[PDB]
Amino acid sequence: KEIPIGKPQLLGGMEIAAVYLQPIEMEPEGMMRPAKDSDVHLEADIKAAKDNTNGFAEGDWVPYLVVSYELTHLDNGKVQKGDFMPMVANDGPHYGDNVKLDGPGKYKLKLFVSPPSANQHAHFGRAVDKETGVGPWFKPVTAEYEFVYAG
Amino acid sequence: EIPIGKPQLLGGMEIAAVYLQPIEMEPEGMMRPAKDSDVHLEADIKAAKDNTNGFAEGDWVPYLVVSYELTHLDNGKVQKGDFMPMVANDGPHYGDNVKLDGPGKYKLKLFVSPPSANQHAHFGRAVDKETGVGPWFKPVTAEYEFVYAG
């Protein structure tokens, strides 16, 4: 099943956790690396925290985020980069990416999370009047997750 | 806020419509200014029970393509537009600020389509045997009527 990595972190009014699991076969296939050419599926689980100031109830998935990453193989310095895509699976939506790793050893996953105002595939608005408005979007946050990959 | 017509069970979702006063939004240039509008029109789209696209009952369904056609039935004036996804203090919704055509009876058609699933896709579907979900719903149309007081 899924392997949690690092520790969940409270940032920008959300709880940001990371896991990996087997590569996930995707439709359309061209959205991301094919599962058959990958080692793992990396996943960010991002939910609203209590007293989120952007209109999301505690435990809600936060959609339209821009989630990017740097994955470093600490044993030799190799860095691979990309974006997590939003997607739905049978346990709900998440942000993830199929990746080919660099062999067993110690890895550092660094996530960069920006609010929906930064999405350049899909515009997303925020109410700002007194009656229906919410607080300003969080400024971009980063979170790190270190783990040992076995194969 | 004033409910429009009745919620409808379509495509594995509950699709309701409401209007309220015009809303100020950021980025403001992406929606009709509140001062130039009569109402904010809102589509409330939530997953129903036993949803086949991975959503729990009551979840907001994101990344949909939602458009509308409004007809002032008194005089036949037709108006078309798109909703944009946005968040307000009661959560996310699909909305648009609209200038109407005066008091009277209106017909609202909501066109709800799934996320793109081709080379333009944002939002993917898992399809393997451990994590996969069913196919996206076929596009649906929901019809409502209401009387606008002015």
Number of CB pairs, chain A paired with chain B, less than 8 A apart: 144
Q: How far is A107 from chain B (nearest CA, A)?
A: 25
> What is the DSSP code (8-state) at residue B55?
P
Cβ–Cβ under 8 Å, residues B42 and B4: no
Contact check, Cβ <8 Å, B128/A24: yes
Rounded Cα distance, A64 and B126, in Å: 18
Q: Report domain A3-149's class.
A: mainly beta
Q: How was this structure determined?
A: X-ray
Peptide bond into B7 cis (omega under 30): no
Domain ranges for chain A, please list them: 3-149
Q: How far is CA A59 from CA A52, A56, A82, in A?
A: 10, 8, 26
Domain B2-148, CATH homologous superfamily name and number: Periplasmic metal-binding protein Tp34-type (2.60.40.2480)
> What is the DSSP code (8-state) at residue B149?
-
Cβ neighbours of B25 in A, within 8 Å: 125-128
Q: Which residues of B91-112 are buried (b: 16+ CB within 10 A; e: fewer)?
A: ebbbbbbbebbeeeebebebbb
Cβ–Cβ under 8 Å, residues B40 and B95: yes
Q: Is A37 on the interface with B (CB under 8 A)?
A: no
Pairing verdict, β B104-113 and B140-148:
antiparallel
Nearest to A66, CA basis, from A12, A146, A7 = A12
User: Which H helix or E strand runs over A22?
Assistant: none
Resolution limit in angstroms?
A: 1.5
Pairing verdict, β B39-47 and B25-26:
unpaired
Report the half-sphere exposure of A133 (CA within 13 A, side-chain side).
13
Q: Is B91 on the interface with A (CB under 8 A)?
A: yes
